Amino acid sequence: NRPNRLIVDEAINEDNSVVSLSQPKMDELQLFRGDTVLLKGKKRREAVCIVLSDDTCSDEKIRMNRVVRNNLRVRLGDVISIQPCPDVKYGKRIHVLPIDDTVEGITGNLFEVYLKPYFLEAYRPIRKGDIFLVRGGMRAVEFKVVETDPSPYCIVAPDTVIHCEGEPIKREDEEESLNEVGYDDIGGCRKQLAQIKEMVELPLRHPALFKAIGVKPPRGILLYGPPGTGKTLIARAVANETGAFFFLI
């Protein structure tokens, strides 16, 4: 029913917005390797991305980067709506702005160090109000386009121009700070993260269904291990990657 609902989990490509699909998926949606795709999420907001042809991932799962999960306000295990738009779209002027939470203490023309070796030879799309992060200078800055030609009608092309401002925009509470810890910030514990997810995500993401079904939830998870192994990191990541109120003791 409605073959357009896609299940979301963490991606494997450690880059900017490049979604990954499964073997039946690119055939069902007749999408090619280097295709420009449009992702539709909750709260009436959109994201435009590039598909990646993967086969040995699972039967039905899309892989979503944490950079663009916040652009769609969708969390792990959530359902996403997708729409292929195989039309080449070039932007003329993108009015782009940083955020004054990650740009403090850095001056000068940050574009020649961040946006130059991040745009060229990539051909990635940009939508209105997209928070994309570029790493460089031994630090990471998330970045915000605020004004451009009508959305999205933009992919990275050499005819797209850039302009320095130096006036970062304040971050509102509608979006989650990407600087916070996520599942991508833990390495070496994937089996343990898998167990934690299996125990935690279903009771929290689907509380009404779980309560109606009348089965015992695991409510006593106890993380243990040698000091400095990421226990606090794992707990805070699970707190952040779910829409659960987190009280720390």
Annotated binding site: 227-233
Q: Tokens 């995500």 label which residue? A: 201
Q: Is 194 in the site for its own copies (CB under 8 A)?
A: no
Tell me which of ligand AGS, Mg ion, its own copies, none is bound by residue 198, counting a contact when its beta carbon lies within the kind-specific cut-off of 5 to 8 angstroms. Answer: its own copies
188 binds, among its own copies, ligand AGS, Mg ion, none (CB under 5 to 8 A by kind): ligand AGS
Q: Could you say which of Mg ion, ligand AGS, its own copies, none residue 93 binds, taking C-beta under 5 to 8 angstroms by partner kind?
A: none
The answer to whether 98 touches 169, Cβ cutoff 8 Å, is: yes
Of 41-49, 84-92, 216-224, 231-239, which segment contacts Mg ion by CB under 5 A?
231-239
Question: How far does CA 13 lie from the centroid of its chain?
Answer: 11
The secondary element (H helix, E strand) that includes residue 141 is strand 140-148
Sign of CA dihedral 187, 189, 194, 197: negative
Span near its own copies by CB under 8 A; candidates 81-89, 103-111, 115-123, 241-249? 103-111
**135 touches its own copies by CB under 8 A:** no
Find the angle CA(30)-CA(35)-CA(37) to the nearest 5 degrees: 85
Cα–Cα distance measured from residue 72 to residue 47, given in angstroms and rounded to the nearest whole number: 7
Residues found near ligand AGS in the complex (CB under 6 A): 186-189, 227-233
Closest distance of CB 86 from its own copies, Å: 27
- Residue 204 phi/psi, 5° resolution? -85, -45
Tell me whether residue 202 or residue 223 sits nearer to its own copies (CB atom): 202
Query: Hey, is 67 helix, strand or coil?
Result: helix
Which residue ranges are tagged as binding site for ATP?
227-233
Classified as helix, coil or strand, 246 is coil
Question: Strand 140-148 and strand 131-135: pairing?
Answer: antiparallel
Instruction: Provide, rounded to whole angstroms, the least separation between the CB of residue 206 and its own copies.
Output: 8
Residues found near its own copies in the complex (CB under 8 A): 1-2, 5, 7, 60, 79, 104-106, 138-139, 195, 198, 202, 206, 208-209, 211-216
Residues found near Mg ion in the complex (CB under 5 A): 232
